[PDB]
Specification:
The structure is a homodimer. By secondary structure, chain A is of the alpha/beta class. Chain A has a single domain (1-440), classed as Metal-dependent hydrolases (TIM Barrel, Alpha-Beta Barrel). In chain A, 33% of the residues lie in helices and 21% in strands. Chain A contains 15 helices and 21 strands. The first copy, chain A, has helices at residues 74-83, 101-112, 130-142, 162-175, 186-198, 206-209, 213-230, 242-252, 264-268, 279-284, 294-306, 321-324, 344-353, 360-374, 460-470, and strands spanning 2-5, 8-10, 15-17, 19-23, 26-31, 41-44, 49-52, 54-56, 64-65, 68-69, 86-93, 118-124, 147-151, 178-182, 234-236, 258-263, 311-313, 392-402, 421-431, 434-438, 441-442. Chain A has an eight-stranded parallel sheet. In chain A, helix 4 (162-175) crosses helix 7 (213-230) and helix 7 packs parallel to helix 8 (242-252). The longest helix of chain A is centred in the middle third of the chain and has 18 residues, at 213-230. The termini of chain A are far apart. Bound molecules: 5-fluorouracil (URF) and zinc ion (ZN) (4 copies). 5-fluorouracil binds at residues 60, 63, 65, 182, 287-288, 315, 317, 336-337 of chain A. Chains A, B: This is D-hydantoinase/dihydropyrimidinase.
C-alpha cells in the first residue's frame, strides 16, 4: 500500500486537505490524518497538490505512419507519460484500408502489451464495408472499445469520405460508441499540397500553407453536422483553429453534445516555427493540424475557459530527425507528429494555472476528468474517490522543470518546447497505486500497464435517446 | 420611344422625382419635366415608383428534372415574370453528367430563344474532366457566361463532390467566373431519404425531414471554405436556414466575398406546409431546400437587413399536380420546385417594405441591383441611368393583388402563396424600353428577349488578385 499524507487533494471541482490511501490498485481511503496500515509506504505530500493522474486520450505509440514507425514505443511512451504525471493513455488502432479492424486491434494489443501504465484504444474507421460494421460491434461488445476515430484528411490513404462518416456514425449510434474525428478537409489539403509542390515550395514552411485553418473549420463543421443529423455525440481531436472552435461552440449552443480536444502545442506555439532556417528544426514541428497564426492560440485558450474545449491530449507521435528527413525534398512526406505526453500536464499547469487563465479544478477537468467522463471511464479514472483506480499525480506548485529533448524521457530527439521552463511540476506519479515517478526517478516497468476497457453508452446516449424518441418522424394520414 | 412621366424614381440608394425617357432599348434621358420626342408614347407614373425591373438570377424554365420537364417554358415563364415586374432572368444550363457543356449550352440557348424578356445562363458543373475545364473557358470567353453552378446535393445525379468543387472553383478563379452553389450535403440527404422511406415515411412531410437545415448549413460552410481556400468569391443560391446564413455572415466577417440569395418562399413559409392534410397541397411546396421551421424566416429577414443576404430570386421550377404526383408513393420522386417569378417583387414589397423591415432602396438592391453587381451586369441592368437597358417597373404602392394559381400567369396549377393579398404591385413593366405589362394587360411576345452576356472578372476579382499578390508564399532560404 501507499499512503499519500499531508497533500491538498485537488479535484475537478474542489480542493481539500486529506490523506489518500492506495492498495490493490485502488484508492482505499480518503480523509484527514488517515491511519497507516502496517508496512504501508508513506509519501509526504505536504505543500503539494494531489490530483488524478493525467489521461492522454490521443497517443500514437510506435505507430506505422507515413512510411516509418514512430520512434516512441508503448513502453517508452507510457513511461515518459508517467514521468510527466500522465497515468493512462488512449491510443489508436489504425487499420489499413481493407484491413480487418479486429486483425489490427489484436496486433496493436501485442504492440501495447509493453505499456508501463494503463492504456486503451480508439479504433479508426479507415474504410467501410458490412464487415467493418460487424467488427465495430465485436470491438465494442468483446474488446472494451467505445470510440471510433475517423480521419477526414489523408486522402488516398486512411481518409473517410462523407459516405463512410455517415455509415460509421450510424453504427456508432447503434453501438453506443463515441465517434471521434480528425477534422481537416482532405480534398483541400491534397489540392494545396500538390499546388505548393508544383510551385517548388517543398520546405516545411509550406506545410501550414497546405492546410490553413479554414480546412479544419470546414471539416469540423461537417463532422458536427453529420453527428447532429444522425443523433450522435462527437469528439473532435486536436482542435487548433478559431474556425473549428467556433463550430464547436455553435453546436454546443444548439444543445449538441460536441467535445473538443486541444494540444499544448496548439495553445502555445504559432506557425512561425515552420519558417525556422534550420530544416530539421522546422520539420520537428510538422504535424497535422499544423501550428497556427497567433490569434488561434488566444481563441483556443478562450475555448478552454468557456467550456467549448473539454480535454487536453498530445497526439504523441514521435519521429526523430532522420525520420522527419524523409521529407527533406517534399514537406508532404515529412512524417507528421510531435511529442508531448511527458510535457502536457506541466505545460498546461504553467501556462494556464499560473497565469490565472484556469483554476486548478479546471486543470484537473481538462487533464483527466473530462476525458474520463466523455469516454465512460469516470469515476474509475479522473476521480479521487474510494474505489477509483489509484492513478494520481503529486504536484509541486513551486517546482521547476526545463523541457529539453536532451533530458526528457520521450524517445525522440526533438521537443517542440525545447528550452521552456515551467513552474509547477509532477514530483511523483502513482499508477495502479504504485509509485512509478519519484522526484526524477522513473520506475516504469515494461508490461505493467493494463488494457482498459471502456463501456459503451456513456450517459449522453441516454439524453439523445429521449430526444430521438421525442422527435420521431410521424406520418400524416391522408 | 416611351416616356414615363411624373413618377418617383427609386434606385438602390435614393429616391427623386424625375421623368424617364426610353428609346432603342435604352434609358435615353432622366430629369424633371423632360420634353417628349415626337410620337413618343407617354406613361403617366403619377403617385407611383419607377424602379429598375426585377432580375431573377435563379429560374429553371422548362427544365428536364426528376423524370419530367417543368411545365413553365421560357416564354410563359419570362412573360409571367414581366407581369410581376421582373424584366430579366438568369437560368441554368444543366448538362447531364458526361455531357458536353457547350452542347448543353446550345440546347438551352435553343429552348430559351422563345423568351419574352432578356435572359442569361449560369452553367452547372455536373461532372469534371479536362474537357469540362476547357469548355468552361469557352463559355466565358465566347458565350457570355461568367457564373458556374454546382449542386452539392442530388447524389447519383448532378451532385459535385469536393474534388469537382475544388477543380471547378479553381477554374472559375482562372476565368474570372463566379462560382455558385446549391448547398445541401448530398450524402446526408440521400441517407435520410432512404432511412425515411425504409421507415415507411413516404409522404411530403418526410421531405423536410430528409434534409433538415443543418445539411444546408454544412454544405454552405464547405462551399464557403473551398472558395476561401482557392481565393474565389462565392454565391450561395436559395439560402433557407439560419445555419447557412450564419456561415455566410461568418465568412463575410472574415473579409470573404460571399453572396447569399433568398426566395420569398423561404422568407414567408414554414415547414408546416408539408403536413397539409391534402397530399397535392403538401406536394406543391416540395422543393429543395425545403421550407423551414419558423425561426429560420426571421433569421433570413435579418440577413437581408444586415447585408448578409444580397439577392432575391425564385428558383422558378414549375411542376403541376400530375407531375408532383410522380412521387405520390415516394416523396423523393416528387419533382422538386415551386413557382415564383411573377410573385417575388410583390411578395417582397408587401412583406419587406410595407412592414418597415426594408427601405424601398433595399428593395431595389435586393430585387435587381445587387444581382447585377454580383454577376457583372451593373449598370447595364439594375440601374436607372442614361445608357442602361430600359428595364423598368412602375410600382403602385396602393395597388392590391391576391396571389392565386387560378389567376397568375405562371404556367403551373399551384401557387405557394395561394390566397395571399399583397399591397404594392407592378402596374407596368418595361423591358427593352417596351411596355410589356400594363394594368392587367400582358404583351409578351415569343422570342422578343435577348440573350444577355455577362463579362468575366467582376471587380471583386481585382481585390482578390491584390490579396493573392500580398499573400504569395515565400520559401525559407536554407
Ligand atoms: O500529426 C498527426 N496527425 C494525425 C496522425 F494520425 C498522426 O499520427 N500525427
Ligand atoms: Zn489527427
Ligand atoms: Zn493523432
Ligand atoms: Zn437549387
Ligand atoms: Zn434551382
Amino acid at each position: 500500500s501507499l499512503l499519500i499524507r499531508g497533500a491538498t487533494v485537488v479535484t475537478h471541482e474542489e480542493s481539500y486537505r486529506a490523506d489518500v490511501l492506495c492498495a490493490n490498485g485502488l484508492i482505499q481511503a480518503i480523509g484527514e490524518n488517515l491511519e497507516t496500515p502496517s508496512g504501508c509506504d508513506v509519501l509526504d505530500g505536504g505543500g503539494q497538490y494531489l490530483m488524478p493522474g493525467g489521461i492522454d486520450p490521443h497517443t500514437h505509440m510506435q505507430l506505422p505512419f507515413m512510411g516509418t514507425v514512430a520512434s516512441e514505443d508503448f513502453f517508452s511512451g507510457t513511461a515518459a507519460g508517467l514521468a510527466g504525471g500522465t497515468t493512462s493513455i488512449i491510443d489508436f488502432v489504425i487499420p489499413n484500408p481493407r484491413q480487418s479492424l479486429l486483425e489490427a486491434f489484436h496486433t496493436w494489443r501485442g504492440w501495447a502489451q509493453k505499456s508501463a501504465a494503463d492504456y486503451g484504444f480508439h479504433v479508426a474507421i479507415t474504410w467501410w464495408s458490412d464487415e467493418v460494421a460487424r467488427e465495430m460491434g465485436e470491438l465494442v461488445a468483446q474488446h472494451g472499445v467505445n470510440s471510433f476515430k475517423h480521419f477526414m484528411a489523408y486522402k488516398n490513404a486512411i481518409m473517410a469520405a462523407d459516405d463512410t462518416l455517415v455509415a460509421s456514425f450510424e453504427r456508432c449510434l447503434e453501438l453506443g460508441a463515441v465517434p471521434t474525428v480528425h477534422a481537416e478537409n482532405g480534398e483541400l489539403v491534397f489540392h494545396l499540397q500538390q499546388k505548393l509542390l508544383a510551385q517548388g515550395l517543398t520546405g516545411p514552411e509550406a506545410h501550414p500553407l497546405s492546410r490553413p485553418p479554414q480546412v479544419e473549420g470546414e471539416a469540423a463543421s461537417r463532422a458536427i453536422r453529420i453527428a447532429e443529423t444522425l443523433g450522435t455525440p462527437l469528439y473532435l481531436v486536436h482542435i487548433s483553429s478559431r474556425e473549428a472552435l467556433d463550430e464547436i461552440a455553435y453546436a454546443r449552443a444548439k444543445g449538441q453534445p460536441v467535445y473538443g480536444e486541444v494540444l499544448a502545442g496548439h495553445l502555445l506555439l504559432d506557425d512561425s516555427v515552420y519558417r525556422h532556417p534550420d530544416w530539421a528544426t522546422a520539420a520537428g514541428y510538422v504535424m497535422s493540424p499544423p501550428f497556427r497564426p497567433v490569434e488561434h492560440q488566444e481563441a483556443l485558450w478562450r475555448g478552454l475557459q468557456s467550456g467549448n474545449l473539454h480535454t487536453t491530449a498530445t497526439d504523441h507521435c514521435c519521429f526523430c530527425a532522420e525520420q522527419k528527413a524523409m521529407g527533406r525534398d517534399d514537406f508532404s512526406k515529412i512524417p507528421n507528429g510531435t511529442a508531448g505526453i511527458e510535457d502536457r500536464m506541466a505545460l498546461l499547469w504553467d501556462a494556464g494555472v499560473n497565469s490565472g487563465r484556469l483554476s486548478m479544478h479546471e486543470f484537473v477537468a481538462l487533464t483527466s476528468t473530462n476525458t474520463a467522463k466523455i469516454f465512460n471511464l469516470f469515476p474509475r479514472k479522473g476521480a479521487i474517490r474510494v474505489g477509483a483506480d489509484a492513478d494520481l499525480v503529486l504536484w509541486d506548485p513551486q517546482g521547476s522543470r526545463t523541457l529539453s529533448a536532451a533530458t526528457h524521457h520521450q524517445r525522440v530527439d526533438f521537443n517542440i518546447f525545447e528550452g521552456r521552463t515551467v513552474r509547477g511540476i509532477p514530483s511523483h506519479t502513482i499508477s495502479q497505486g504504485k509509485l512509478l515517478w519519484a522526484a526524477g526517478d522513473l520506475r516504469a516497468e515494461p508490461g505493467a500497464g493494463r488494457y482498459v476497457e471502456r463501456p459503451a453508452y456513456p450517459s449522453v446516449y441516454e439524453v439523445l435517446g429521449r430526444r430521438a424518441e421525442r422527435q420521431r418522424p410521424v406520418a400524416v394520414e391522408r
